[PDB]
RNA sequence: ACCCACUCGGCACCUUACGAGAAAUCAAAGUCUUUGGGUUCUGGGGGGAGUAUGGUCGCAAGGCUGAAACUUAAAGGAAUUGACGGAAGGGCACCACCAGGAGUGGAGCCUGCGGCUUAAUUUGACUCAACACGGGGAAACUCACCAGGUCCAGACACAAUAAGGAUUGACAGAUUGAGAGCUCUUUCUUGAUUUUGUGGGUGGUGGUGCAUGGCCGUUCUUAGUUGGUGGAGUGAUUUGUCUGCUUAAUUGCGAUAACGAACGAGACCUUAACCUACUAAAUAGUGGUGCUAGCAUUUGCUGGUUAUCCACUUCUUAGAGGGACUAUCGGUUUCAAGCCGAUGGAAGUUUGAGGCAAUAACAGGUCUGUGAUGCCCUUAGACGUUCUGGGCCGCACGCGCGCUACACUGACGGAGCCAGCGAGUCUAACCUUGGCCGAGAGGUCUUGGUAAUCUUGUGAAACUCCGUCGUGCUGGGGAUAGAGCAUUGUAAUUAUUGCUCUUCAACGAGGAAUUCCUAGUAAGCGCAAGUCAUCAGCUUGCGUUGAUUACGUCCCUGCCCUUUGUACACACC
Ligand SMILES: [Mg+2]
Ligand SMILES: [Mg+2]
Ligand SMILES: [Mg+2]
Ligand SMILES: [Mg+2]
Ligand SMILES: [Mg+2]
Ligand SMILES: [Mg+2]
Ligand SMILES: [Mg+2]
Ligand SMILES: [Mg+2]
Ligand SMILES: [Mg+2]
Ligand SMILES: [Mg+2]
């Protein structure tokens with residue numbers, strides 16, 4: 001047939017990053033705990049899930065995408 | 072037509088290592104046994120066999 | 136000189152074979168393993184080679200005599216069956232000609248093939264047996280090609296990573312053709328389903344049809360193939376299966392060391408033809424009668440009414456039977472099979488047309504129909520797949536199939552007005568009557584039909600009739616092109632198709648060549664079906680109108696058969 005072409009530059013993939021994440025609570029002087037990052041008021045996301053802070057933007061990743069609560 | 076009547080065919084593909092071969096089987100059933108159709112080939116012509124007679128004998132007649 | 140008989144010795148031929156031979160053959164090539172009449176000469180697998188060398192003869196050319204080393208499994212003879220021939224003799228056929236028809240080849244366009252062009256213009260096939268073929272009428276899809284964008288649908292096994300998270304997804308922005316989280320920013324989400332690697336798989340319209348199956352085409356519009364018992368031969372084989380005749384036919388008759396048979400042909404099957412005989416029918420139809428319209432009236436004529444009743448089965452339908460067997464008679468012939476004519480008959484060309492179809496051959500075509508398939512290739516920056524867009528249509532040109540034409544046996548306009556084979560909608564939008572609207576194409580409201588019930592009597596077209604035109608590229612012809620309207624579809628630009636106005640080309644019967652065809656056939660003419668969302672100038676079938684000319688032959692071409700040659704048998708590639 002032919003075999004190969006290309007003007008260079010191959011597309012990569014994704015990472016899903018690292019992060020030893022969930023440090024985003026705050027436990028006080030033995031031993032009260034106050035959750036940072038506000039949680040999501042959907043019937044499908046039982047408060048365990050949280051909102052990511054961007055700009056304007058607060059976002060439920062649990063809703064695989066859905067819903068855009070903003071304060 | 073007797074084909075439709077009396078022969079049964081079947082091909083089968085047997086799949087071996089070097090390639091495949093085809094089996095082709097033919098069977099011709101005895102038409103005399105046919106049970107539910109022509110009991111013979113359209114060919115068949117049977118002549119019934121006469122009986123050796125002892126004729127002659129001048130008239131005569133029976134009564135009842 | 137001639138005729139007859141005989142006899143020595145000649146040149147030969149004929150017929151047999153006791154006998155001989157590996158056979159072909161042979162009155163010797165016989166009288167040979169039952170091996171001896173006398174004598175001469177030569178050969179001992181094939182090449183090397185009649186070569187080297189020595190001797191001898193010769194003017195020469197060369198004659199006679201005449202090795203080895205080495206190489207090699209065969210070379211050779213006769214006969215048999217095939218295969219083949221640019222040998223001979225017969226045949227057969229409208230894919231041959233004769234007698235003719237209608238044409239193609241010339242034109243415009245349609246359509247395939249080449250060629251060129253191209254990002255790509257995907258590809259198979261090239262005499263009959265490639266080129267309107269791949270059911271191949273491609274706008275997406277199809278799709279194989281080109282410009283580019285995702286996804287894994289990477290089974291399984293081992294290992295690695297790793298719950299302090301293997302991996303998953305994403306809103307907005309950026310980006311992108313794109314409201315693809317493709318990638319990137321950002322920071323949630325997911326919880327052992329993945330991700331990495333190795334191994335192993337997997338898909339593929341990737342290659343190989345010169346690895347295969349299966350199917351198909353071709354030889355073949357052909358008539359060939361085989362076994363029993365006997366005859367011939369050491370044998371492979373042959374005869375049977377053949378000079379002639381006859382048939383569409385190895386179909387038969389007849390001749391006959393053959394007799395009597397089996398495959399294929401025939402028979403058979405399907406369809407078209409004939410049934411006032413049989414069984415029937417509100418899904419077919421007839422006569423009568425009720426109800427009823429029109430005209431005439433003297434009873435009459437022509438209609439209406441899926442049931443107002445009665446009877447029938449001619450027409451229609453499809454079950455069962457019947458019918459034809461070239462019958463009767465005649466002419467011809469080996470008075471054989473048969474052929475020919477007249478009568479009758481629905482039918483007498485295998486009744487017409489098909490289906491089926493032995494053995495064998497081909498490197499025929501098909502891996503691009505198949506989740507048929509071996510092997511090779513490729514497998515995540517994919518030759519997997521899908522999404523967007525282009526392309527298969529691209530145009531100096533060569534070749535094929537076609538369509539429409541050059542008019543007056545016609546075009547146009549009114550009017551007459553007649554088929555046959557089909558097909559149609561369920562978890563759906565198929566076939567469409569009727570009513571309106573619209574110049575048309577179409578639109579809209581309803582409706583019947585899963586159908587002998589409705590579309591549909593498919594009122595099809597050629598055709599027939601009365602008119603206009605009047606031989607003028609004319610009103611024959613309708614290419615090309617403009618401008619508008621609609622239909623299919625997500626989508627119509629490179630115009631899907633349909634309609635309207637306008638534009639009005641070549642073509643004035645076609646050189647060399649070439650195709651098909653013998654009766655409801657050729658030709659003319661439409662229609663249904665396949666394809667199909669939309670698109671037939673294609674095909675498969677169908678009926679409508681309906682001829683001229685053979686009813687022969689071997690000139691051409693093609694093939695088959697015998698005879699014959701062969702050093703071929705992987706068979707003249
Ligand atoms: Mg020979
Ligand atoms: Mg002629
Ligand atoms: Mg001519
Ligand atoms: Mg090839
Ligand atoms: Mg595409
Ligand atoms: Mg792997
Ligand atoms: Mg590998
Ligand atoms: Mg495949
Ligand atoms: Mg082949
Ligand atoms: Mg094959």
Ligand SMILES: [Mg+2]
Pocket residue numbers: none
């Ligand atoms: Mg013929």
Ligand SMILES: [Mg+2]
Pocket residue numbers: none
């Ligand atoms: Mg013998």
Ligand SMILES: [Mg+2]
Pocket residue numbers: 376
């Ligand atoms: Mg013979």
Ligand SMILES: [Mg+2]
Pocket residue numbers: 448
């Ligand atoms: Mg009847």
Ligand SMILES: [Mg+2]
Pocket residue numbers: none
């Ligand atoms: Mg007559």
Ligand SMILES: [Mg+2]
Pocket residue numbers: 498
């Ligand atoms: Mg080949």
Ligand SMILES: [Mg+2]
Pocket residue numbers: 501502
């Ligand atoms: Mg195949």
Ligand SMILES: [Mg+2]
Pocket residue numbers: 527
């Ligand atoms: Mg094409």
Ligand SMILES: [Mg+2]
Pocket residue numbers: none
């Ligand atoms: Mg053709």
Ligand SMILES: [Mg+2]
Pocket residue numbers: none
């Ligand atoms: Mg007219």
Ligand SMILES: [Mg+2]
Pocket residue numbers: 573
């Ligand atoms: Mg209008």
Ligand SMILES: [Mg+2]
Pocket residue numbers: none
């Ligand atoms: Mg209905």
Ligand SMILES: [Mg+2]
Pocket residue numbers: 608609
């Ligand atoms: Mg004109």
Ligand SMILES: [Mg+2]
Pocket residue numbers: none
């Ligand atoms: Mg015209």
Ligand SMILES: [Mg+2]
Pocket residue numbers: none
């Ligand atoms: Mg159609």
Ligand SMILES: [Mg+2]
Pocket residue numbers: 267673
């Ligand atoms: Mg076609």
